Scaffold this active site. Structure first.
Site, mmCIF file in Angstrom:
data_model
loop_
_atom_site.group_PDB
_atom_site.id
_atom_site.type_symbol
_atom_site.label_atom_id
_atom_site.label_comp_id
_atom_site.label_asym_id
_atom_site.label_seq_id
_atom_site.Cartn_x
_atom_site.Cartn_y
_atom_site.Cartn_z
ATOM 1 N N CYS A 139 0.816 -1.128 -0.001
ATOM 2 C CA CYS A 139 -0.159 0.011 -0.056
ATOM 3 C C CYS A 139 0.712 1.363 -0.097
ATOM 4 C CB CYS A 139 -0.731 0.132 1.317
ATOM 5 S SG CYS A 139 -2.206 1.194 1.492
ATOM 6 N N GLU A 188 1.295 -3.870 -5.622
ATOM 7 C CA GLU A 188 0.071 -4.616 -5.506
ATOM 8 C C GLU A 188 -0.995 -3.797 -6.060
ATOM 9 O OE1 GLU A 188 -0.609 -6.246 -1.720
ATOM 10 O OE2 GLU A 188 -2.748 -6.459 -1.934
#
Ligand SMILES: Cc1cccc(C(=O)NNS(=O)(=O)c2ccc3ccccc3c2)c1F
Ligand SMILES: [Zn+2]
Length: 272
Positions: free
Chosen positions: A140, A174
């Protein structure tokens, strides 16, 4: 009622998304956060008392990067669980592509600060899985709203690849990415690849670029395709661009702002 506004440091910031702070904290008009230890508080009065007593003037963990007044701390989620949980709660006010990390222990957090005489002021961070099966070098990434579109995201993207290079591996963030995250990664990949194409006396392949940059071949190819700098021949992508064409792209406004650079010499990190 959810939290709709926070006060952190000298900033007041409106929330973008729900974050699962406890109900008695959400019902307040505002949440007050210590910018150094990230304790959150219900009242201006408890905040002001905390300001005068808290001894922290920077993130915990190891300062793995420092050049002039730009610093990165490496924070293990297992060793600093409450700090990292509070960081996640803060970030979730501004992210909705990422379910909130109810468990921070599998992650290491890289906190970006800019420093003045008062202390090291948090701008944002990225998290990374301590062991990522996939090739994810970022789990993140969050830049606080007042710092967005000001070069700090580019710095953290560059930093995550500098770590990947030190690990002798390629990596990719991601997915999904936020809309701004998407544009930022695409511009970063474009700039890095164009720069290498401009400066390299000789023929670089896609595999070459991937090894030099730690960008995955897939992200290189999609970037070269958006730039129209790749041919296809008998099942393989092949770079095809003139030096003049690379220069034209690099003169575009997207890359006109001088970056905050990552000086490899100031990075104090070895792979575990
Ligand atoms: C990943 C992410 C998540 C959330 C916010 C940001 C962000 O604020 N991006 N804007 S930027 O840092 O100024 C930024 C990023 C890449 C750039 C690449 C080339 C040229 C210039 C750039 C400026 C972000 F990058
Ligand atoms: Zn504090």
């Amino acid at each position: 009622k959810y939290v709709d506004k926070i006060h952190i440091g000298n900033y007041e910031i409106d929330a973008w998304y729900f974050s699962p702070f406890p109900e008695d904290y959400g019902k307040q008009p505002k949440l007050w956060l210590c910018e150094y230890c990230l304790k959150y508080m219900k009242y201006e009065k408890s905040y002001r008392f905390h300001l005068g007593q808290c001894q922290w003037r920077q993130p915990p963990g190891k300062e793995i990067y420092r050049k002039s007044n730009i610093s990165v701390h490496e924070v293990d989620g297992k060793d600093h669980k409450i700090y990292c949980q509070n960081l996640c709660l803060l970030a979730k006010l501004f992210l909705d592509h990422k379910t909130l990390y109810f468990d921070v222990e599998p992650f290491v957090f890289y906190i970006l600060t800019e420093v003045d005489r008062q202390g090291a002021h948090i701008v944002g961070y990225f998290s990374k899985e301590k062991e990522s099966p996939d090739g994810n070098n970022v789990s993140c990434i969050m830049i606080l709203p007042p710092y967005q579109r000001r070069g700090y995201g580019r710095f953290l993207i560059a930093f995550s690849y500098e770590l990947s290079k030190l690990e002798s591996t390629v990596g990719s963030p991601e997915k999904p990415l936020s809309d701004l995250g998407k544009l930022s990664y695409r511009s970063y990949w474009s700039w890095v690849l164009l720069e290498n194409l401009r400066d390299f006396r000789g023929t670089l392949s896609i595999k070459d670029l991937s090894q030099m940059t730690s960008i995955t071949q897939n992200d290189i190819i999609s970037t070269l395709q958006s730039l129209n700098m790749v041919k296809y021949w008998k099942g393989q992508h092949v770079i095809c661009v003139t030096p003049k064409l690379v220069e034209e792209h690099l003169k575009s406004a997207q890359y006109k702002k001088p970056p905050i650079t990552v000086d490899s010499v100031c990075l104090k990190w070895a792979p575990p």
